[PDB]
Write an enzyme that holds these catalytic residues in place. Structure first.
Site, short mmCIF file in Angstrom:
data_model
loop_
_atom_site.label_atom_id
_atom_site.label_comp_id
_atom_site.label_asym_id
_atom_site.label_seq_id
_atom_site.Cartn_x
_atom_site.Cartn_y
_atom_site.Cartn_z
N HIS B 41 30.44 55.41 50.51
CA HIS B 41 31.69 55.21 49.74
C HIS B 41 31.41 54.87 48.28
O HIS B 41 32.38 54.81 47.50
CB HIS B 41 32.65 54.29 50.50
CG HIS B 41 32.33 52.85 50.41
ND1 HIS B 41 32.28 52.03 51.52
CD2 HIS B 41 32.15 52.07 49.33
CE1 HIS B 41 32.02 50.79 51.11
NE2 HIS B 41 31.96 50.79 49.80
N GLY B 143 32.02 44.42 45.37
CA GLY B 143 30.66 44.53 44.83
C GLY B 143 29.59 44.17 45.85
O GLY B 143 28.43 44.43 45.53
N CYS B 145 29.24 45.40 48.92
CA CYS B 145 28.88 46.49 49.81
C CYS B 145 27.42 46.88 49.56
O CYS B 145 26.97 46.83 48.41
CB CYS B 145 29.81 47.67 49.63
SG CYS B 145 31.51 47.23 50.10
O1 LIG Z 1 38.40 43.57 45.44
C1 LIG Z 1 39.29 43.18 46.11
N1 LIG Z 1 39.27 43.38 47.56
C2 LIG Z 1 38.16 44.04 48.23
C3 LIG Z 1 37.15 42.94 48.58
C4 LIG Z 1 36.03 43.31 49.56
C5 LIG Z 1 35.54 42.32 50.38
C6 LIG Z 1 34.51 42.62 51.26
N2 LIG Z 1 33.99 43.82 51.34
C7 LIG Z 1 34.44 44.79 50.55
C8 LIG Z 1 35.47 44.58 49.64
C9 LIG Z 1 40.46 42.46 45.43
C10 LIG Z 1 40.22 41.73 44.27
C11 LIG Z 1 41.25 41.06 43.63
C12 LIG Z 1 42.53 41.11 44.15
C13 LIG Z 1 42.77 41.83 45.31
C14 LIG Z 1 41.75 42.51 45.95
F1 LIG Z 1 42.02 43.23 47.10
#
Ligand SMILES: O=C(NCCc1ccncc1)c1ccccc1F
Ligand SMILES: O=C(NCCc1ccncc1)c1ccccc1F
Lengths: 304, 304
Positions: B41, B143, B145
């Site tokens: 991805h 970040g 991943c």
């Molecule tokens: O970046 C975001 N969410 C993905 C986080 C994530 C966690 C774990 N593994 C992959 C990705 C985000 C940032 C600010 C506000 C809302 C959001 F949805």
């Protein structure tokens, strides 16, 4: 998303661990520059430990009696000295893997990572806090002495703890890297009882903020309180008094969630008085107190 | 003495973490020999993620579109291929810090260490388990991943997990290092609900043995049970069925404590039916299920 008890990456400290043997005693040492730091009790027989005179025992020791092994290579000891409860073994080779480092003496309620070692070899890493009674609740077997506690700030390792002993209650005592014990403890096999292990209130509040950030919100209530009112309840439950300094430290988390610190205090007050009622917060059935406000911000912001 | 949620030392894995950028997406890669492994991805826009055709998106990508940085030095990409849900970026330089390693696909209930990274830089290490529903409960921000899960056997790193995504319920899904997701999950931003997160019974029993070894014994009772009787109670409480294979695996801990596995099952049965009554076991108010029998033996014996 999610919130874990997280240790610092251990590589920079792994590069510093050596084995120290004196006679029949093997434990761990910390090799920084051309000095190896280890507990002075490396010189004791288990019998010595009942009432050791370290100055007198050390007179019988020469440089060549301290066997220092880094991986499977011997280091040459060219000097030794005692500083408080640590020995400093001067070696003829600077550790090539020496990171940027500091020695810091932490306060109760501050957290750190422990790299548990045996025979100079890393076994595991976990996260600890200096308890208000100056014990730590670690995981240490015979041979783990000289294992260290540390924090990292980007590329600088701040060493704050070196493991020295286990109290009869199975809690741990040690020194800073200047060899000064945390709390009233001594490197002697004697009656050393720990005082009250109070809960680190500011850390609990930090962790409740972490919970709200991560979507655990069921414990948020309609109430507020005052520092004085909250503190009456804290005292009843063997929690540390909350100070305005702690409220100031929680300011960034308050701003991140829009929950006033004293409103979170009122949530914590209800949790103390009412219990969890079989519910969990961030996978815990008890209020977690080994995350500092700085830890919560660090883990919630992804600092490297 | 004491028992901690303990991760493997992370140094050998720190030496393998790199940054991978494709267009505006930065995440982490694992550099072993002359191959960098990362989530496929990395090639997607957040918009792509709603219904990505990875073969079609990858046709638009050349070696020079994959920016791989190891510390502050760029690696030269000389080939790329997709294997299931990971990309393999062939680079012109073998990682000089490549440890002995294996790729292993773990079973539910097996634990591992995660080295959480951002921009190819380690932020922290913690201990996870593969849940029975093939999720993990990690600590991962945008970040993270390509951060990996691993076990160590002395000097060989067995990589078992690479982080790919967060479900709407804030639990985590990923792949083995062959790019196959654990469980039914896909690398698409779609409706993916997790099944029942049952408790890993064999791990709970291991942790009760750890508790007895470490002097927490209050929950030991006068009773025994049978696998079938215990399993009726397990089913009621969303615990995994206990098998004779699990009883066999607990044999060394049974022998270490002299508590028959089925007697410990009867202690666990009473804890399920009666609750903790405000008591704790190894500092927990709930029954901990992210230590394997192997983990308990390892930590109780000080393996390096
Ligand atoms: O970046 C975001 N969410 C993905 C986080 C994530 C966690 C774990 N593994 C992959 C990705 C985000 C940032 C600010 C506000 C809302 C959001 F949805
Ligand atoms: O070695 C033992 N106890 C000291 C452990 C220890 C823990 C933490 N820090 C320093 C030392 C021992 C071994 C077998 C039987 C009885 C014992 F007492």
């Amino acid at each position: 998303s999610g919130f874990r008890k997280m240790a610092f990456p251990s590589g920079k400290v792994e590069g510093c661990m050596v084995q120290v043997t004196c006679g029949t005693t093997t434990l761990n040492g910390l090799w920084l520059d051309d000095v190896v730091y280890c507990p002075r009790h490396v010189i004791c027989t288990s019998e010595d430990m009942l009432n050791p005179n370290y100055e007198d025992l050390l007179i019988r020791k020469s440089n060549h009696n301290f066997l220092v092994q880094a991986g499977n290579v011997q280091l040459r000891v060219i000097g030794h000295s005692m500083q408080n409860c640590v020995l400093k073994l001067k070696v003829d080779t600077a550790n090539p893997k020496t990171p940027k480092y500091k020695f810091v003496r932490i306060q109760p309620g501050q957290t750190f990572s422990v790299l548990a070692c045996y025979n100079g070899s890393p076994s595991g890493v976990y996260q600890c806090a200096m308890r208000p009674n100056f014990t730590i609740k670690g995981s240490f077997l015979n041979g783990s002495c000289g294992s260290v506690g540390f924090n990292i700030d980007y590329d600088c390792v701040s060493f704050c703890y070196m493991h020295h002993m286990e109290l009869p209650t199975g809690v741990h005592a040690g020194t800073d890297l200047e060899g000064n014990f945390y709390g009233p403890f001594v490197d002697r096999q004697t009656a050393q009882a720990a005082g009250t292990d109070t809960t680190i209130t500011v850390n609990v509040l930090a962790w409740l903020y972490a919970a709200v950030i991560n979507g655990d919100r069921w414990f948020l209530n309609r109430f507020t309180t005052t520092l004085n009112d909250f503190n009456l309840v804290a005292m009843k439950y063997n929690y540390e008094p909350l100070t305005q300094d702690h409220v100031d430290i929680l300011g960034p988390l308050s701003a991140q969630t829009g929950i006033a610190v004293l409103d979170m205090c009122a949530s914590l007050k209800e949790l103390l008085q009412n219990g969890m009622n079989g519910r969990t917060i961030l996978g815990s059935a008890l209020l977690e107190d080994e995350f500092t406000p700085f830890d919560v911000v660090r883990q919630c912001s992804g600092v490297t």
